[PDB]
Structure 1
Amino acid sequence: MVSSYFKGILLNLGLDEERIEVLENKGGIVEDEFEGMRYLRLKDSARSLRRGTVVFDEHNIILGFPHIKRVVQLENGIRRAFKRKPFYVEEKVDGYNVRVAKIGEKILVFTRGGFVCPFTTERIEDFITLDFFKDYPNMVLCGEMAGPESPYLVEGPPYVKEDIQFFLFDIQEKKTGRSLPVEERLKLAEEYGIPSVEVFGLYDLSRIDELHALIDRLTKEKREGIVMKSPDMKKIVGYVTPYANINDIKIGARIFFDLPHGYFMQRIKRLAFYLAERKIRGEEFDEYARALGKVLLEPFVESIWDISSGDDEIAELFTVRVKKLETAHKMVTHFERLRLKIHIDDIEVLDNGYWRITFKRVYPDATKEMRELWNGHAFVD
């Protein structure tokens, strides 16, 4: 299942031989390959080695991201996490996270599960100077890839009007995964001109009313929310806008089936706690209730009508821009290896010489369940 080359590295990191065998047999560790370079992916956590960790050799170990906790009640979430101590407040940007690292002579870009993204790996030179990795070869740039032409999302921040952008939110050490303190990370982003998430400033519990006002502005601006970080990066909590919760449901309800457990319920919960904390009542409350009902039902009913004839599969269209047509071929191979059903729908050359690729992503499992129910399949609750 997994080479003794990689199991030897795990042994030297202190994993037990029995744990390695269980991980190997259960598919918790798997081998992958990018441009001929073999590496190990952690599909499950292995003690200190978080899910999404990748191992190329004894030194080139890129730790997966911790799961960052969210609060649904902002004022008490702050009181619990930070008491009255100060914390940085940054934008939560709605994209996909990436880790950028120098591996051998190559700059590689990893998505959350530890896959090398051929698209982002080709594009990352458009956003980050490679000087950073000449000076800090053992550091990992951590950021959100976000915009309207994304390979993995169909939404994004309003201020990215075309293509896609990188937004730094952390700088971590290889092997240990240790985060730089906020201030040092921000100094490095300045020094190397690395685009950053917006840092709104330094706040504390006493400024809760300014933070509510910020959330209200972000909601009207169709932005995702905030991430709250102690200066030493040891305490991190996120809080998202009602816009983010409502729009997530709208996008998801087109598919409905085969989504992460609790996808819709969690966002209904976050909406209810926002309405409760902000004391929203009267007509304003009614507009949220109407919006929630609309985004749950309208996209879902439309897909039912789509599938009800019997030909089509539920689908999402998206576009990306690539420098080389060869990258588009590599993404098709990459999607096929990820067990996604995605094909090229259109291609256009742009006036700057980039290729704009339109992909169509279809959802056969959600389609099957939706169609079986339409066709009268009977099931127990």
Structure 2
Amino acid sequence: DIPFDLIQERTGVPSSRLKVAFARGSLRLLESAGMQALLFKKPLGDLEAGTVIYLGDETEVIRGFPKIRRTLLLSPTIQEHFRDRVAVEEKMNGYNVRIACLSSGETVALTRGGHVCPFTTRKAQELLDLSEFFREHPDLVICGEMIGRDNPYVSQDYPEVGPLGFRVFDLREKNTNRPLPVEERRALLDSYGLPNVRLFGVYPIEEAASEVADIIRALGMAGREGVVMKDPSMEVPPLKYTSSQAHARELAYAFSYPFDFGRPFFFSRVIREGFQAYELDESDDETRERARRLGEAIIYPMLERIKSISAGEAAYEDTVIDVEDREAAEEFIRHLVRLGVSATLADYRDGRATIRRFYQSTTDRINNYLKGGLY
């Protein structure tokens, strides 16, 4: 049974609160070296959502990755949040991965919720040489973005990393979740042959907002997601800010399965376009492009989705991945499913498993409308 007082000491959360959280947002589950773990679905105190506690030789807290705040404007805001210098990295469109070595020597890759992903743990050690880093730094949690076209979670092709890849943006200590300063982190990860997310530079605070403006113009015309700005000694939390095309991308995806994204959502992205038009457009023409790009991202995917279902096709998405065997693919399917995702194996040849995700609500509601159902 759950060692509530031990956890109370390791976390700073009173054993009383923890029993209140065992009503709802605190799950006990088997994972790793026959080990019993606790997964904080909801945040609780200093503890972040996605926090996982492993109850082994030592009880290790794998803190959840912290929510990064958003800004819609580069100025005055950057000068209003930061001090002296701003480090500016590339925002990787992928899925958040915390890699840790546990007291059992076992290496584990946590999805944002704190679940171990069988696919992510396999691929993370396949594509990363972690052995020596963890021998020397076993209480540092590698925080990164799994990216690439053959990505079961968020699929964007970053050709320079291959079909599947990884990029570290953080080193955070177990339990305390304290980050290493930016430039030390990059160096340390360099000297173990580990990949850092692209860093555009470190700029004095006066010039930061303009420097970020050019980068974003560059990132947009490349079709990349955007930027994450950081206090070089991480004594100020980060701010994220994204490109217009990044917003058209998400929106276009969202209006392809419009009834699976819980309403706004949609408002939040569009609003980013208002303030960004106010700040980055240097001609009416550009603002015109911005409008055209927004309309088309909305109409055309929704028009094709509707045509599709009209022609008998249910709304689905496929993503072909590398797996070890068909059993492995199946196990990953189950994991997506216990995450509330409609998924099945659609095809399997050698080690390549076609993961099929179904969007039931988009299929149903567009069918009911096409048959004469009333809004």
- Output the TM-score relative to the length of structure 2: 0.92
Tell me whether 1:274 sits opposite 2:276 in the alignment. yes
Give the C-alpha shift of residue 322 in structure 1. Answer: 2.7
Q: Is the 8 A contact 2:330 2:345 kept in 1?
A: no
Structure-2 residue corresponding to 1:38: 36
Give the C-alpha shift of residue 168 in structure 1. Answer: 0.4
**1:4 partner SS:** coil
Q: 1:133 to 1:126 in 2, by over 3 A?
A: same
For 1:18, the aligned partner's letter is S
Q: Is the 8 A contact 2:94 2:155 kept in 1?
A: no
Structure-2 residue corresponding to 1:169: 169
Per-residue CA deviations over 1:187-225 (Å, capped at 9, x if unaligned) read: 211111111100111113432333322111111111111
Q: Which of 364, 370, 379 is the aligned partner of 2:366?
A: 370
**1:142 partner SS:** strand
Structure-2 residue corresponding to 1:119: 119
Give the C-alpha shift of residue 325 in structure 1. Answer: 4.2
Q: 1:9 to 1:260 in 2, by over 3 A?
A: farther
Give the C-alpha shift of residue 41 in structure 1. Answer: 0.8
Structure-2 residue corresponding to 1:255: 257
**1:126 partner SS:** helix
Q: Is the 8 A contact 2:54 2:61 kept in 1?
A: yes
For 1:48, the aligned partner's letter is D
Structure-1 residue corresponding to 2:300: 298
Q: Distance in 1 between matches of 2:369 and 2:282?
A: 37
Structure-2 residue corresponding to 1:230: 231
Per-residue CA deviations over 1:308-359 (Å, capped at 9, x if unaligned) read: 35x543111112123444432321221232232211222344xxxxx22221
Structure-2 residue corresponding to 1:352: none
Q: Distance in 1 between matches of 2:283 and 2:368?
A: 40
Tell me whether 1:361 sits opposite 2:363 in the alignment. no
Structure-2 residue corresponding to 1:342: 343
Q: 1:286 to 1:332 in 2, by over 3 A?
A: same
**2:374 partner SS:** coil
**1:345 partner SS:** strand
Q: 1:303 to 1:9 in 2, by over 3 A?
A: farther
**2:241 partner SS:** strand
Structure-2 residue corresponding to 1:70: 70
Q: Distance in 1 between matches of 2:359 and 2:29?
A: 24
Q: Distance in 2 between matches of 1:39 and 1:374?
A: 47
Structure 1 unmatched ranges of 5 or more? 350-354
Give the C-alpha shift of residue 15 in structure 1. Answer: 2.4
Give the C-alpha shift of residue 175 in structure 1. Answer: 0.7
Tell me whether 1:109 sits opposite 2:109 in the alignment. yes
Per-residue CA deviations over 1:151-186 (Å, capped at 9, x if unaligned) read: 1013243534x4211100000000111101112211
Q: 1:326 to 1:106 in 2, by over 3 A?
A: farther
Structure-1 residue corresponding to 2:25: 28
Q: 1:190 to 1:360 in 2, by over 3 A?
A: same
Structure-1 residue corresponding to 2:45: 47
For 1:217, the aligned partner's letter is A
More deviation, 258-267/90-99: 258-267
Q: Distance in 2 between matches of 1:39 and 1:317?
A: 32
Q: Is the 8 A contact 1:218 1:224 kept in 2?
A: yes
**1:206 partner SS:** coil
Q: Distance in 2 between matches of 1:195 and 1:105?
A: 22
Give the C-alpha shift of residue 368 in structure 1. Answer: 2.5
For 1:45, the aligned partner's letter is P
Q: Is the 8 A contact 2:281 2:287 kept in 1?
A: no
Q: Distance in 1 between matches of 2:204 and 2:365?
A: 48
Alignment of 1:170-189 (within 5 A): 170-189=170-189
Structure-1 residue corresponding to 2:86: 87
- Output the TM-score relative to the length of structure 1: 0.90
Structure-1 residue corresponding to 2:197: 197
Q: Is the 8 A contact 2:88 2:212 kept in 1?
A: no
Give the C-alpha shift of residue 280 in structure 1. Answer: 4.2
Q: Is the 8 A contact 1:90 1:197 kept in 2?
A: yes
Q: CA RMSD in A?
A: 2.0
Q: Distance in 2 between matches of 1:268 and 1:342?
A: 30
**1:358 partner SS:** strand
Q: Is the 8 A contact 1:96 1:152 kept in 2?
A: yes
For 2:200, the aligned partner's letter is F
**1:132 partner SS:** helix
Structure 2 unmatched ranges of 5 or more? none
Q: Distance in 2 between matches of 1:297 and 1:265?
A: 16
Q: Is the 8 A contact 1:145 1:166 kept in 2?
A: yes
Q: Distance in 1 between matches of 2:123 and 2:264?
A: 34
**2:336 partner SS:** helix
**1:24 partner SS:** coil
% identical equivalent positions: 33
For 1:241, the aligned partner's letter is S
Structure-2 residue corresponding to 1:136: 137
Q: Is the 8 A contact 1:31 1:38 kept in 2?
A: yes
Q: Distance in 2 between matches of 1:333 and 1:340?
A: 9
Q: Distance in 2 between matches of 1:137 and 1:155?
A: 31
**1:195 partner SS:** coil
